[PDB]
Paper text:
Vegetative insecticidal proteins (Vips), which are produced by Bt during its vegetative stages, have a wide spectrum of insecticidal activity, especially against lepidopteran pests. Compared with known Cry toxins, [name] toxins share no sequence homology, bind to different receptors, and lack cross-resistance, therefore they are considered as ideal options to complement and expand the use of Bt in crop protection and resistance management. [name] toxins are large proteins (~789 amino acids) consisting of a conserved N-terminus and a variable C-terminal region. The ~88kDa [name] protoxin could be digested by insect midgut juices into two fragments: a ~20 kDa fragment corresponding to the N-terminal 198 amino acids, and a ~65 kDa fragment corresponding to the C-terminal fragment of [name] protein, which is regarded as an essential step for its activation and toxicity.
Here, we report the crystal structure of the C-terminal fragment of [name] toxin (Vip3Aa11200–789). Through the addition of an N-terminal MBP (Maltose Bind Protein) tag, we were able to isolate crystals with improved diffraction. The final structure of Vip3Aa11200–end was refined to a 3.2 Å resolution with R and Rfree values of 0.1980 and 0.2389, respectively. The crystal belongs to the P21 space group and four MBP-Vip3Aa11 molecules were found in one asymmetric unit. Then the protoxin can be divided into five domains, starting from N-terminus: domain I, 1–198; domain II, 199–327; domain III, 328–518; domain IV, 537–667; and domain V, 679–789 in Vip3Aa11. The overall structure of the Vip3Aa11200–end resembles a lobster, wherein domains II and III form the body, and domains IV and V are the claws. However, domains III/IV and IV/V are connected by long and flexible loops, which indicates that the relative locations and orientations of these two domains could change under different biological circumstances. Domain II of [name] has an all α-helix fold, including two conserved hydrophobic α-helices. Several studies have reported that domain I of 3d-Cry toxin is involved in its membrane insertion and pore formation processes through its conserved hydrophobic α-helices. This therefore suggests that domain II of [name] may also take part in these processes through its conserved hydrophobic α-helices. In our work, the C-terminal fragment of [name] alone has shown no toxicity through cytotoxicity assays and insect bioassays, and it forms a dimer in the crystal structure, which is consistent with the fact that the C-terminal fragment of Vip3B2160 will form a dimer instead of a tetramer without the N-terminal 21-kDa segment.
Author numbering: 21 to 418, 421 to 716, 721 to 771, 776 to 822, 825 to 985
Write the structure that this text describes.
């Protein structure tokens, strides 16, 4: 229940509250806004008590170290000072008031411990710490001590300890790493050891409190003391002429005192956030405002650059600022509470002799880190429970995770089921639910065994760590786990693996319309490589991924040589449009030492054949012979698929074993009723598994390897070829797509030499907003692909070709007519070349043979009336191929294409037949085939017959 139109300020009583009230009176007399400055006791503890319920002051004045804990609970409002105002204050003071990249308070003053000395007895103060023990003896004879400061609090003894490299929490990238504590390093040891040695040599007293130290110095009983600007007011009254200088250096390095920044935060529950902003930015953080506070009680150094230059004329303020820059900014995280207790107890124990410096700091680093799981049993048990919950989510994407847990338990207690082992009954369930899944039975069941043993390994690992956490006696569960493991391997190898099938097919289908034109597609591996995996996916474009790689011993894939080649126009074959398509179907299977390296698809005259090449593979050397080949094809058995204007259901999904392995079988099946086209292959996984039981298997990648765009997905480290253009291009907006990073707008990346001239590519990107994506040559201006102004994340997928202009091609993401745009997961893919079906002419003029009266005049073939003419030309045909005879005929003629035994085509035209186009096919017989032009009858010698434009391709 806060009021509006009024400002209420809470500032500590040690501050100049009367001066801040005078600035408030100036604020009210210029704006009408009442400013009430209150100085409550326990102000650091009372603010979170009242602010948690929504009440409290509008502005809170305290050191920045406690404002992180306030921002933790969302008690401070995010201030929004413009860039012009931010430059009026020192940049290091803005970092003290920054929490998780958010500004939470305005910095007012800067304070830090400094060396205070008595000029009457010490004209020049000692520059280094090591001089103090020597100089102490020379003044002890005169009845005085050298140095006396507060030893009970660690805030005072820390600059000496942190001199040689001590630190509370490692500061990196604006974040305090709670797992890195620097109290037990060599630097902190040397620091505290010197402090203890000063006490052992009776140069300092381990019981000196704040009161004892201040009294000794202000009455000239000691030469030096360490204190802050707050202590100046009390020595001013004593008139003991004092100077404030830099702190002594230790081991050549300067003392590092903690730096406190007096900050003014705005209550996140205050309804006067605009009123508070005006008071702080325009009235308090000014030369007149800070001076008014300074006149009441000194502020020391100030964050305002303007007024600090005026204050630096005082050597005391210049010294506090000098010491502050040498020291380290106080961490504002709440874990400092453990740090303070750790160092406070360590210095006390080390001074009193209860512990040595090595012992005090070792447990101090344990206590400082205590808010994070200590390395060992506590840290591991948390990592093991998290890794186990990930394994749970791995097998709950609809069996279930509890199925694995039940099966795992049944193996441990030796609970056999249905007479066979529990692994067998679990395996039979795998082959009864994974029937429409990528991979074969060998792959799917072996994958089940991998997860089962991975859970088995974690269960035994969790047990071991749980016993260490409980202080229980060590037990080595390695042999009892290995015993269970070998029993599981033996069961799968002898009882489960042989009865499993090694055939895998496509898991899904997609209703798709292709083309009716002839087409060729040759999937071939590089010399020495083998085809190892396939994936068909159709999102507006049909893309075929083929995986090849070198082979190692026993059908293992060479991870170093794994390549991914992209083939386009997969839908253009396997699918007709408005017409029929004949699919020749023969399951090809090679012997047990040959690996498929080449699949040759041939679409000719609405017929689809394939010819598979398999080279010989050696199980002792990784060599695949380039000359010991075997070639089989879809020979003669054909299925016919009617026109059906609504498509043909192309095969979709991952045609691969669950682990990338070579294949020795391939076949296409087409159902004449359901129009389902099914690709099926046989895998080498069982031969691999039977030969090696030593996860060196490779899983078929989900995304596209060989992606031309580097860093395409922007979810990696700042390593990126993307270049921002020196504008508001926003390197890495974290919180983009799905939660991950995304490009905000612009950004450009050079691809350039990775492109090929006059080659077809596929671009894909998930963008939102109004993006202007261009793939243009920044030298000639040639645009290879453009995505101009388009409406509101969607994954656009288009296919394009480049031309002759590549030595400057960039992928540029910018916006249209000044708007914003987000783009993620850019993909550019090369489409390996396909080749045009070469159907040559098989009829030549000089290859005709005559019987009877005939005549050959150009394109006209004439069978004379009286002469019983028969023309015959031999045809050079292949074993399993589709051809087409074309001609026009006028007389009563009979065309027939025949061999000594087989006939491919025969028809009698007892009338004019213009533009005849008949297809014929060969079945394993290719030699001694000929076309025979003759008359339909031979009565009276036959009628006159003219053949026009005879052609066979």
């Amino acid at each position: 229940k806060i009021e509006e139109g009024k400002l209420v300020i809470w500032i500590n009583g040690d501050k100049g509250y009367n001066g801040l009230a005078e600035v408030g009176k100036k604020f009210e007399k210029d704006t009408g806004i009442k400013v009430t400055v209150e100085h409550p006791d326990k102000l650091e503890e009372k603010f979170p008590q009242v602010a948690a319920t929504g009440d409290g002051p509008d502005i809170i004045f305290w050191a920045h170290d406690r404002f992180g804990g306030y921002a933790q609970s969302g008690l401070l409002a995010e201030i929004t000072p413009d860039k012009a105002f931010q430059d009026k204050l020192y940049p290091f003071t803005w970092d003290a008031v920054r929490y998780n990249g958010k500004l939470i308070a305005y910095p007012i003053a800067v304070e830090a411990l400094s060396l205070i000395y008595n000029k009457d007895l010490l004209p020049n103060p000692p520059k280094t710490w090591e001089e103090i023990p020597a100089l102490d003896k020379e003044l002890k004879a005169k009845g005085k001590s050298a140095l006396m400061f507060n030893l009970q609090e660690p805030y005072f003894t820390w600059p000496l300890i942190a001199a040689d490299g001590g630190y509370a929490f490692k500061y990196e990238n604006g974040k305090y790493d709670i797992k890195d504590v620097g109290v037990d390093n060599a630097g902190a040891k040397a620091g505290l050891t010197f402090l203890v040695d000063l006490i052992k040599n009776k140069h300092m007293n381990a019981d000196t409190d704040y009161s004892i130290a201040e009294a000794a110095f202000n009455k000239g009983e000691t030469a030096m003391t360490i204190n802050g600007p707050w202590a100046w007011s009390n020595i001013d009254t004593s008139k003991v002429n004092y100077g404030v200088t830099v702190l002594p250096t230790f081991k050549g390095q300067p003392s590092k005192p903690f730096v406190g920044v007096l900050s003014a935060g705005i209550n996140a529950a205050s309804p006067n956030k605009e009123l508070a902003k005006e008071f702080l930015e325009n009235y308090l953080l000014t030369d007149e405002g800070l001076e008014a506070v300074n006149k009441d009680k000194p502020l020391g150094a100030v964050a305002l650059k303007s007024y600090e230059e005026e204050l630096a004329k005082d050597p005391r303020i210049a010294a506090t600022m000098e010491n502050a820059q040498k020291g380290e900014i106080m961490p504002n995280i709440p874990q400092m509470s453990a740090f303070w207790y750790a160092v406070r107890t360590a210095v006390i124990n080390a001074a009193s002799g209860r512990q040595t410096v090595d012992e005090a700091l070792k447990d101090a680093q344990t206590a400082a880190r205590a808010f994070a799981a200590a390395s060992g049993s506590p840290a591991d048990i948390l990592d093991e429970l998290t890794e186990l919950t990930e394994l749970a989510k791995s097998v709950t994407k609809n069996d279930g995770f509890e199925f694995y847990l039940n099966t795992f338990h049944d193996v441990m207690v030796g609970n056999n089921l249905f007479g066979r082992s529990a692994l067998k009954t679990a395996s039979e369930l795998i082959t009864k639910e994974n029937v429409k899944t990528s991979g074969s039975e060998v792959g799917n069941v072996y994958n089940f065994l991998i997860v089962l043993t991975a859970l088995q390994a974690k269960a035994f690992l969790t047990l071991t760590t749980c016993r260490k956490l409980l202080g229980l006696a060590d037990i080595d569960y390695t042999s009892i786990m290995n015993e269970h493991l070998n029993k599981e391997k033996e069961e799968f190898r002898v009882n489960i693996l042989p009865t499993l099938s090694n055939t895998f097919s496509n898991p899904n289908y997609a209703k798709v319309k292709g083309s009716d034109e002839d087409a060729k597609m040759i999937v071939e591996a590089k010399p020495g490589h083998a085809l190892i995996g396939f994936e068909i996916s159709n999102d507006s474009i049909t893309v075929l991924k083929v995986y090849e790689a070198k082979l190692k011993q026993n059908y293992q894939v060479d991870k170093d040589s794994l390549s991914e080649v992209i083939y386009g126009d997969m839908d253009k074959l396997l699918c007709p449009d408005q017409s029929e398509q004949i699919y020749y179907t023969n399951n090809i299977v090679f012997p047990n030492e040959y690996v498929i390296t080449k699949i040759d698809f041939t679409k000719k005259m609405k017929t689809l054949r394939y010819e598979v090449t398999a080279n010989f593979y050696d199980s002792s050397t990784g060599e695949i012979d380039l000359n010991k080949k075997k070639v089989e094809s879809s020979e003669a058995e054909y299925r016919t698929l009617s026109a059906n204007d609504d498509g043909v259901y192309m095969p979709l999904g991952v045609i691969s074993e669950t682990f990338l392995t070579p294949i020795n079988g391939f076949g296409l099946q087409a159902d004449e009723n359901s129009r389902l086209i099914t690709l099926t292959c046989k895998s080498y996984l069982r031969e691999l598994l039977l030969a090696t039981d030593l996860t060196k298997l490779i899983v078929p990648p989900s995304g596209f390897i060989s992606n031309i765009v580097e860093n395409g997905s922007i979810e990696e480290d700042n390593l990126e070829p993307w270049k921002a253009n020196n504008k508001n291009a926003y390197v890495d907006h974290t919180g983009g797509v799905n939660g991950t990073k995304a490009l905000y707008v612009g950004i450009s990346q050079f691809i350039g030499d990775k492109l090929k001239p006059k080659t077809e590519y596929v671009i894909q990107y998930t963008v939102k907003g109004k993006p202007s994506i261009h793939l243009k040559d920044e030298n000639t201006g040639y645009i290879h692909y453009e995505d101009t102004n388009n409406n509101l994340y969607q994954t656009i997928n288009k296919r394009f070709t480049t031309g002759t202009d590549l030595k400057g091609v960039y992928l540029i993401l910018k916006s249209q007519n000044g708007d914003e745009a987000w783009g993620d997961n850019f993909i550019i893919l090369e489409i390996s070349p396909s080749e045009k079906l070469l159907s040559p002419e098989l009829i030549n003029t000089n290859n005709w043979t005559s019987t009877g009266s005939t005549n050959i005049s150009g394109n006209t073939l004439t069978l004379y009336q009286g002469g019983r003419g028969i023309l015959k030309q031999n045809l050079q045909l292949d074993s399993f191929s589709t051809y087409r005879v074309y001609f026009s005929v006028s007389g009563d003629a009979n065309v027939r294409i025949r061999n000594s035994r087989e006939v491919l085509f025969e028809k009698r035209y007892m009338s004019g037949a213009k533009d005849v186009s008949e297809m014929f096919t060969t079945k394993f017989e290719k030699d001694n085939f000929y076309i025979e032009l003759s008359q339909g009858n031979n009565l009276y010698g036959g009628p006159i017959v003219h053949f026009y434009d005879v052609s066979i391709k």
